[PDB]
Amino acid sequence: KVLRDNIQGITKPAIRRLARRGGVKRISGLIYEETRGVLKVFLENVIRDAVTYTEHAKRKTVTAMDVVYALKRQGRTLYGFGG
Amino acid sequence: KVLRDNIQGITKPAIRRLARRGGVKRISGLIYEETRGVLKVFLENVIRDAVTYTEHAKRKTVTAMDVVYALKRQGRTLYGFGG
Amino acid sequence: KRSRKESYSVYVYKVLKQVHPDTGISSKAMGIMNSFVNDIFERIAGEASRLAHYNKRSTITSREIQTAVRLLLPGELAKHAVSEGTKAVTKYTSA
Amino acid sequence: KRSRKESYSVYVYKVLKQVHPDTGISSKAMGIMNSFVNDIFERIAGEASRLAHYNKRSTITSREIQTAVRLLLPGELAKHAVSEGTKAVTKYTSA
Amino acid sequence: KPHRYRPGTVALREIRRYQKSTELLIRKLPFQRLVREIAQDFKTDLRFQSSAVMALQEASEAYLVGLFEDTNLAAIHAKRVTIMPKDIQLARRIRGE
Amino acid sequence: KPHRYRPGTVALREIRRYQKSTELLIRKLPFQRLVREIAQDFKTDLRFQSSAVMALQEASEAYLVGLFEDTNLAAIHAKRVTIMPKDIQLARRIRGE
Amino acid sequence: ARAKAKTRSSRAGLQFPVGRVHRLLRKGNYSERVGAGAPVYLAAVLEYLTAEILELAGNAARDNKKTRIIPRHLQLAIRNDEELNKLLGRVTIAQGGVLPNIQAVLLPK
Amino acid sequence: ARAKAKTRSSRAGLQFPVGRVHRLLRKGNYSERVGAGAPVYLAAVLEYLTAEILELAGNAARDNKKTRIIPRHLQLAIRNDEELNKLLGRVTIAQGGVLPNIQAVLLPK
DNA sequence: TCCGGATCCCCTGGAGAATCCCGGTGCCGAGGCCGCTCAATTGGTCGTAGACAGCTCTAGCACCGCTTAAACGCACGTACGCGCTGTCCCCCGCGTTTTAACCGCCAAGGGGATTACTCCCTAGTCTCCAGGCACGTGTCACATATATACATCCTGTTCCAGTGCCGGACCCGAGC
DNA sequence: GCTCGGGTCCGGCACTGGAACAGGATGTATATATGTGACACGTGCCTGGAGACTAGGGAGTAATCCCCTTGGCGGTTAAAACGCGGGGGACAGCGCGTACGTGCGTTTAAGCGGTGCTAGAGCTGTCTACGACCAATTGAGCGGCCTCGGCACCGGGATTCTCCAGGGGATCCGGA
């Protein structure tokens, strides 16, 4: 029922692919865990606002609308899911 | 009234003073030119917004209030001017 | 049935057929278009409400709409925008 | 003959006296506080408007105000602010 | 002799390959596990629409790739080609978090 | 033989001085002259409230000083103590202007 | 004895709905009182914005020899226009990717 | 014949005006209707924020041995608190100055 | 020292290999058609917000006259970027093994969403009043000046260890 | 074989390079004195906030249903993960040459005080253009469905990129 470690699910090759999309051709070995950390921070920051939007709506299921609102409040507004 | 060359009106030691407030220990001699340019661009943007606000306001005088608006919609809010 | 849900699909479809009669759209692209147009709409409407509150005017009018699009949209896009809006106002005024 | 401009100098001066009877204030610092209270008030009010807009509520209530307080204010500021506002609205309810 | 490319040539090839392409780079179900894991830390037993998870996933990859191109610029600015965690620490401090 | 401080000592002293002080580092008259000059290019016959000029003044020192700690972070990141124009261009491009 | 029900979008000669945008401004709570010409202006502006973005996307798609526009085409269109990039710097396109760009020092000699 | 005049801020027991904030929200056009407890809650959270920033200004001023608060003291208060910095990252205070901050590599030896 | 062979660096060519390009094919979202319905339309009314006229006064604009603060500028100097080199080691390329991602398929049920209802609250209007704002006044908190007091920072001065070398000791060779 | 003298080498000594340390000068703090104006506090007021009552409507709540989400089971493989190497990159050391730092003399231009004008900021009364509110109505816009061709995937051949193994010149070292 509970989950305790899924930050390791963001594997090293996925981070490598993202860095290739960022254009980085050489990645140090110390990058992966701190990118996991900054991912953890960003995810906390967005989903806290998302679940706040949800619980104000008195829902037990989040909407994608709430995720869009959380990103547009944070200054990283998302196109392609509204409506 | 009508002036030409006031980009040099921001003197070099004034830029040194801003750098010392910024904690710069050593400044290249080239620096003052692009700081003058960046200052010109920044003031140009905010003053375009300000004259837009005042021109909508049907005023010939630029007020501080609209300057506060122009900065804060640009994400650079200032406090202490009645805003 | 279901309660009606509003979208901007068909208007953008006429717009595409005016600018490119031959090509089509993906529904993902149309979702981006709805997000875009709603985003720009709320930005300009927020600027409009901001200006109308500032000058102590109880009406929203077109004048601050040119003000808002001129302050928000950059440069040539802004003055082009003022152009089609001005001529659209002229035909709307003349019915 | 003059027309008023309203301000928050009296209230901030009072709450300064309850928190510190023996301290003064400069007027330009009070202008900074005026801008502070107006800026935070407009942020909470606009976010409250968006929350009322999302769930199709035409009435603004204290619940989404409390929601916006969690939304903007981080953590400790949020939980304590929710606490004081909650106890305050309990006294207002009893009043 | 089995062929072997010199280092960086292949890496540049995945740069071109993944920069032309748009398809999603991380595994979606471990991402769903991670977002549920962090989500239950605020409130218990939340339910997710798959579209919401994909959208938040897309926003997450956008945030990462943006800070990646910033740390790429920083690492070049430090006269190097390899990014290191102080480079990205610089990038996060400059951006304002 | 007369006294002469080594390089950087005086610089650190005015660093401490100007960090302690809050007064405006730009002369008011040429700055407002430049403000009138640039504003003339957008609209003729403009007049200025003085407090507007000071408000956009601390806007100018705010934006400048912010780019200067950004430039300081960039410069110390390259193991250097002297800033160059590519440092400011880097800081602006990371900030996205 | 009513006249023929004519539409205000046709009165402007534009395609974006005057009545819908007018209703959204009335119910979006931006003013208590709304002028007649402002939704016409706004609809014209938005229609031109959609027109120019769709022009850029269609030109990119015909460059990419695809006859149906793609989110990738939208991203490549908006990122390659400078003023739209200034407008849309802080937004993310779903399924969009990024500009093809390698830095000069990353290239081999 | 009529109840004696007794304000709503006293009913809340708060110093910030319930009536003024209520009127501002009514003419701020954020909703068509307004709940009674919402401006009370808003005044409460505003007064808590202003309260805590006033103790921060007061003890920062007392460290400088000045009984009247200074914009320099306000800037020192907001920059030395992490959560208020997160609240106030993108605002600059007039005559605020900067924190006393030197990089360690800039120091001698 | 000059000439001739050896050798190394660049210079080139060709093989592998990853990718682009050209059809083939089958597939499923997109566009188009049709039915419905509800929101834009049309018309009239009635109120009211803003444009305009007009007046006032005030703050900005301009000018001038001193009065130094500092900006400019030169000159000499350290120190810092910076480029080369060298050296180590870290991470990409590639191969093999593992594994869980994912499709896809099916069950089940949970709450999202909708409709009906009835009511709690609230916008609105009237009346009245006291709270906050402009105004006036005074007054001590802070700005500034001046005189000490110490911090600190660079640099001359003496100290201490590294080291070459003066003298003794040991070993080696030669003379008796 | 003994003995003695010289040569040479190493231990202590003195010479010398490097570093701890004191001291002076300057800059910053700090203590005391003094004015002054901005903060604080009393005052008139009027108008925005509070009190009473009502109409009604947005919103809470009750029922349902069904759609959407969660759970679980089997297969496959692509993705991950782990190991080897080895070269490319990180990084440190070293010289070096410049490029601001610092310091002092000068120019001047910013700043402050004072004066005069008025352009426009801003307040007030009118009233009219303009637009919210509401009844009738419809046709434009949305939901459902259908068909297909634009496109995703598959497969074969061409093409361009990469990189290392033979030629061409240049340079270096040895021999005459």
Author numbering:
A (entry chain F), B (entry chain B): 20 to 102
C (entry chain D), D (entry chain H): 30 to 124
E (entry chain E), F (entry chain A): 37 to 133
G (entry chain C), H (entry chain G): 10 to 118
Article sentences:
Here, we report cryo-EM structures of human H1-containing tetranucleosome arrays with four physiologically relevant NRLs. The structures show a zig-zag arrangement of nucleosomes, with nucleosomes 1 and 3 forming a stack. H1 contacts DNA with L1, the amino-terminal part of α2 together with L3, and α3 to stabilize the nucleosome and contribute to chromatin compaction.
When Δβ was close to zero for both linker DNAs emerging from a nucleosome, H1 binding was observed. However, when Δβ was higher, H1 was not bound, likely because a stabilizing contact between loop L1 and linker DNA could not be formed. Furthermore, exit DNA of nucleosome 1 shows the highest Δβ value for the 4×177 array, which is the only array in which H1 is lacking on this nucleosome. Altered linker DNA trajectories, as observed in our 4×177 array, sterically preclude H1-linker DNA contacts that are required for stable H1 binding. We now report structures that show that short NRLs impair H1 binding to stacked nucleosomes and suggest this is due to altered linker DNA trajectories.
